[PDB]
Amino acid sequence: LTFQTSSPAHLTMPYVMPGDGEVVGVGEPVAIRFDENIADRGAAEKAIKITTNPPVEGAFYWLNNREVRWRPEHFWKPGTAVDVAVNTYGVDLGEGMFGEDNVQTHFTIGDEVIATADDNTKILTVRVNGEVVKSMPTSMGKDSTPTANGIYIVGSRYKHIIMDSSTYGVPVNSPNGYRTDVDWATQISYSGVFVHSAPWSVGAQGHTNTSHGCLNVSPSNAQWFYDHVKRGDIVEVVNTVGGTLPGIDGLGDWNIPWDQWRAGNAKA
């Protein structure tokens, strides 16, 4: 143990996800987010030791200047134990910025839970370890505001949340603007896509797309999703008229092809 002297305005703290001791889904990447921009990505990666059991090949990819992710080529095998040692204390992270402390977390992978939202059938089907446990009618984004296709990682969940168009730069008082109370909302993208309760589209669920891009389901089905789907589980959207979710979204990691992810984006 060696003390690292510091100087105000030249320290950055790492924050690691998922939580210590947590059980997460098969899509959960290791995430290390710093409270400052990181100039020397190579130094940061060198200081982070991720080990797995059973062992699988994984690699780092930076979503932006603040946050690096680590994942394998394919979804985790259930039961896998993951250990994360962020040994950044005193590490020069570039441009006079030094790691403020170390962090050490461990987590495990739970059941394989993959929910497929098929735009052609307008059914969201939840499969746990391969078996269908739930089929829910859904209404996705209308043609002018479609839901993006791709693999989404399940994030946070809310019993209630406010959808306010003003955080998207759109005044509430201008159709395309809105201030919506929503129950049972499960986040699937940082950009703001959720699976949530939508009593106002129950007639369209299973039939037509009427949403702004979110996956509208019934109140009971949304609560079910809130109760039974956890961080790191997967929602795959297929067959919409939209494009693909950006790989750097925050929950879109799996949309980046393995060869690109593995090659990384730290200087050679």
Burial 35-53 (b: 16+ CB within 10 A, else e): ebebebbebbbebbebebe
Residue 191 binds to ligand MXR (criterion: CB under 6 A): yes
Part in contact with ligand MXR (CB under 6 A); list of ranges 1-9, 22-30, 185-193, 220-228: 185-193
Q: How far apart are CA 51 and CA 47, in angstroms?
A: 13
Q: How far apart are CA 10 and CA 4, in angstroms?
A: 12
Q: How far apart are CA 35 and CA 38, in angstroms?
A: 9
Residue 44 φ/ψ, nearest 5 degrees: -60, -45
Residue 192 binds to ligand MXR (criterion: CB under 6 A): yes
On whether 191 is known to bind a ligand per the annotation, the reply is yes
Q: Tell me, yes or no, if 196 is annotated catalytic.
A: yes
Give whichever of 25 and 141 is closer to ligand MXR, judged by the CB atom: 141
| Contact predicate 134/127, CB 8 Å | no
On whether 178 is known to bind a ligand per the annotation, the reply is yes
| Contact predicate 14/34, CB 8 Å | yes
Residue 47 binds to ligand MXR (criterion: CB under 6 A): no
Give whichever of 27 and 213 is closer to ligand MXR, judged by the CB atom: 213
- Which positions from 88 through 147 interact with ligand MXR, judged by CB under 6 A? 141, 145, 147
On whether 252 is known to bind a ligand per the annotation, the reply is no
> Which of 216, 245, 212 has its CA nearest to residue 146?
212
Residue 211 binds to ligand MXR (criterion: CB under 6 A): yes
Residue 212 binds to ligand MXR (criterion: CB under 6 A): yes
On whether 6 is known to bind a ligand per the annotation, the reply is no
Amino acid at 87: N
Q: How far is the CB of 18 from ligand MXR (least distance, A)?
A: 24
Q: Which two tokens stand for residue 84?
A: 């994360």
On whether 239 is known to bind a ligand per the annotation, the reply is no
Q: Which residues bind to ligand MXR, rule: CB under 6 A? A: 141, 145, 147, 163, 191-194, 211-214
